[PDB]
Amino acid sequence: EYERRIAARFTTFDQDGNGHIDRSDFSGAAKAMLAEFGVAARSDRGQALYGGAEALWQGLAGIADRDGDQRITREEFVTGAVKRLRDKPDRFAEMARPFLHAALGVADTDGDGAVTVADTARALTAFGVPEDLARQAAAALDTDGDGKVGETEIVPAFARYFTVPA
Ligand SMILES: [Ca+2]
Ligand SMILES: [Ca+2]
Ligand SMILES: [Ca+2]
Ligand SMILES: [Ca+2]
Ligand SMILES: [Ca+2]
Ligand SMILES: [Ca+2]
Ligand SMILES: [Ca+2]
Ligand SMILES: [Ca+2]
Ligand SMILES: [Ca+2]
Ligand SMILES: [Ca+2]
């Protein structure tokens, strides 16, 4: 189901489930990830995560919020955003790179610049992915099998996930 594929991508952005995407969906996601890792909002890494999340919101709103009211409806996403995301996925993933870079920093619990598969799964659950599925997705992100999930793995995976195939 092509339509269900679309709905899945919408749900990932609609973190609070209320049928439209707001800046608050993104800030709420940042809040939940910081809480999962015990990283303070006011810390350098906390500020970088909120900043990246806000930038991703602006990137999505720029593509999808066609009436300018700073809510992206299901209709706006389905009728507008899907094609545009499919047509320019790498450019969209670049708008997410500050968020994704900041998220890696949050999930690096020992400070060595690397993130485990297990901690990648924790991040995904903070973003609403059920625990079993999150383990499966985290594992799939480790494309070279060294047990670590890095930026060169997550940025193209993000680009691919938001390319809803026809
Ligand atoms: Ca919402
Ligand atoms: Ca709202
Ligand atoms: Ca701030
Ligand atoms: Ca709108
Ligand atoms: Ca680490
Ligand atoms: Ca978890
Ligand atoms: Ca559990
Ligand atoms: Ca399972
Ligand atoms: Ca890896
Ligand atoms: Ca590697």
Side-chain angles (χ1 to χ4, degrees), residues 142 144 146 148 153:
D142 184 20
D144 63 359
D146 53 21
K148 292 111 171 166
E153 290 166 329

Side-chain angles (χ1 to χ4, degrees), residues 10 12 21 25 31 40 46 58 69 101 112 129 133 146-147 150 154 158:
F10 185 80
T12 297
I21 304 158
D25 281 305
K31 181 179 265 209
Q58 296 299 171
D69 71 346
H101 188 263
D112 67 8
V129 182
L133 208 71
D146 53 21
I154 69 172
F158 178 101

Side-chain angles (χ1 to χ4, degrees), residues 100-111:
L100 298 170
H101 188 263
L104 287 164
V106 171
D108 172 14
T109 66
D110 61 356

Side-chain angles (χ1 to χ4, degrees), residues 80-98:
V82 175
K83 167 169 162 291
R84 295 213 208 271
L85 289 176
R86 174 188 307 120
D87 287 354
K88 59 178 199 191
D90 278 19
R91 271 213 269 167
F92 182 65
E94 291 305 318
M95 297 278 284
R97 193 181 284 272

Side-chain angles (χ1 to χ4, degrees), residues 99-144:
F99 176 73
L100 298 170
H101 188 263
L104 287 164
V106 171
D108 172 14
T109 66
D110 61 356
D112 67 8
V115 174
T116 66
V117 168
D119 288 334
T120 299
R122 287 172 62 192
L124 294 180
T125 66
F127 303 145
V129 182
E131 188 185 273
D132 186 53
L133 208 71
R135 290 189 294 261
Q136 299 182 41
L141 287 172
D142 184 20
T143 54
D144 63 359

